[PDB]
Amino acid sequence: MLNYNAPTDGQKSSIDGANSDQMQTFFWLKKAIITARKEQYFMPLASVTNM
Amino acid sequence: KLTSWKNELSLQALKADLDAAKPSHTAMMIKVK
C-alpha cells in the first residue's frame, strides 16, 4: 500500500528507502514582493542653483 | 473645462512640467552669464 505519508515532519514516503527522500516538497513562484518609493512633497518646491 | 477633449491637461500639470524643467535651464544659464 504505497502511501505518500508526509515527507516533511520526518514520516518518509512508503516508496522511499533508508538513504533517500523526496527531492521537491514545495513550489516557488519566483515573483518577489517589493514596496514602492515614498512620495516627495518638499523636493518639487526647491529650485537648484548648480554653481 | 475649456475644450471638449476627453482627457484635459489642467494648469497643474503644465506648472509641474515647468518646475521640473527649470533645474537644468537654471544650471545652463550660469555659463551664458
What is the rounded distance in angstroms from the CA atom of residue B24 to the CA atom of residue B17?
Answer: 12
Contact criterion met (CB < 8 Å) for A50 and B16: no
Q: How far is A32 from chain B (nearest CA, A)?
A: 33
| Final resolution, Å | 4.0
Which residue bears the cell 484635459? B8
Q: Which residues contact A12 (CB under 8 A, 6 or more apart)?
A: A5, A21
The residue of chain A with its CA nearest to that of B22 is: A47
Q: A6: which strand partners?
A: A11
Give the residue carrying C-alpha cell 514582493. Answer: A33
User: Please, which experimental method was used?
Assistant: cryo-EM
Give the residues across from A11 on adjacent strands. Answer: A6
- Whether residue A11 contacts residue A5, with contact meaning beta carbons closer than 8 Å, is answered with yes
Q: Which of residues 1-51 of A touch B (CB under 8 A)?
A: 44, 47-51
Q: Which three cell numbers stand for residue A10?
A: 520526518
- Residue in the structure block whose three cell numbers are 515647468: B18
